[PDB]
Design a protein around this ligand. Structure first.
Ligand SMILES: [Mg+2]
Lengths: 209, 210
């Protein structure tokens, strides 16, 4: 069947929305979904891209992606879906940028060993991380990046998560564009920020009471 | 029905490919197609990084668009489809940049009065051209721009004219993206120059000369 390969950094709000879209697509279309890790920190490693004043901030971004790579190595790519969902729910839906806590709680959420958190304070996963990152990002700029049946695109840039059959129609459309080698761009000007679907998280908080 | 509003300058190769695409769509889908004039010269005027020598060159790109606007004012928007087809066939499919020949012959092909060619040597139509241009281009960057069911996009950027059912599927896809107001971009690096339909050009040449 058709295949979506999707590269994510847990910190990226655009990856978050587009990945939730893919997951919606897989509920209404028969597709294979493979997640792969990429790194905003790698995109921002050079001072010509991110001034030194910000590096103390961006250095925190290595932790979650190192942990994701470590999790995938030990437990298989199958764990990336639940681990990413957990990290993204805390980062985007709950607004948590305390990434030590996000890592610890997300590993727990995904039923994984707590020891994986130690990957954040290691470079042992960085070669694997860089290989994964470049496989996704080189082929097309920034996030979000998807391959639709082996064809790499930047986007779709979505500011809200499409659901159900609407999500499925957007996938059908993407597959058509991917199937035409002489199509390169469809774009309109964006002036609105990402909007997350925070209702479930709010209901979860309420029901824990 | 679904509607394509398409803005074109006869000199633009990307407008040519995308407009030919839409005409292919119309063969395999029920669609309303409306053409409107825009101007590469106006695009260039409004840049702040264009050297003077190129501004002088762009000052020579007003002819075909002025004539198109004049033709529309006199005979209605309905004339833009046949007039543009005639101009573009010559400019792009035949590589003819003798714009006086192109304008004269294209007015004739479209059954329009020869005197419309005089619009090229006037500024009387320039405000109308600016209004038309901005209506198309501002709503979205440059060409090609299309409005799909009222929604303005840059693109689809196509380097080759899609034909047959493939043209139709690409339209279906565009309509779906247009229908979701929180979609903004799908892109890959352009690695192809514009490709015109050389077969069509040669068959036309054959049909009319042989
Ligand atoms: Mg009009």
């Amino acid at each position: 069947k058709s295949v979506a390969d999707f590269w994510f950094d847990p910190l990226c709000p655009w990856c978050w929305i587009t990945s939730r879209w893919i997951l919606e697509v897989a509920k209404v279309r028969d597709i294979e979904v493979n997640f792969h890790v990429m790194s905003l920190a790698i995109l921002n490693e050079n001072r010509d891209d991110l001034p030194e004043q910000y590096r103390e901030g961006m250095a925190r971004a290595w932790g979650p992606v190192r942990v994701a790579i470590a999790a995938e190595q030990a437990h298989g790519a199958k764990v990336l879906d639940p681990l990413y969902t957990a990290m993204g729910n805390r980062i985007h839906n709950q607004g948590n940028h305390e990434l030590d806590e996000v890592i610890t709680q997300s590993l727990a959420d995904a039923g994984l060993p707590a020891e994986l958190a130690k990957a954040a304070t290691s470079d042992a996963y960085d070669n694997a991380l860089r290989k994964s990152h470049h496989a996704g990002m080189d082929a097309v700029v920034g996030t979000p990046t998807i391959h639709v049946n082996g064809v790499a695109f930047f986007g779709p840039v979505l500011s809200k998560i499409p659901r159900g059959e609407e999500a499925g129609k957007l996938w059908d459309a993407s597959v058509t564009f991917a199937s035409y080698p002489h199509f390169f761009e469809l774009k309109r000007t964006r002036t609105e920020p990402p909007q997350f679907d925070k209702l479930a998280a709010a209901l979860e908080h309420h029901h824990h009471h």
